[PDB]
Amino acid sequence: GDGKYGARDADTKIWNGMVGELVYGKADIAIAPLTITLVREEVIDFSK
Amino acid sequence: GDGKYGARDADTKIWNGMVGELVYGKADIAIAPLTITLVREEVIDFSK
């Protein structure tokens, strides 16, 4: 929707982007050039 | 114990090396230049 990868807002604590459409249930699997980071490995699972 | 990395025998179905000393309960964690492969992930978990 918002055309973004994914990072957490510092204020609203709201995850946006691809990651956001996962943790909020709006999608099941994410296939895109998403970068494996720490804060992301905490909220979602990553393949190799 | 055998100085090997970790591969499975095709005849006897045994795991040698560090993968083996993990799957057979000899060690708790394998910190070494151990290549992440499809067959190795199938018996022991790998970190990123």
Ligand SMILES: N[C@@H](Cn1cc([N+](=O)[O-])c(=O)[nH]c1=O)C(=O)O
């Ligand atoms: N690390 C690899 C084993 N391994 C090691 C070396 N090495 O010693 O640099 C190599 O050249 N090639 C190889 O397959 C593995 O874990 O399978």
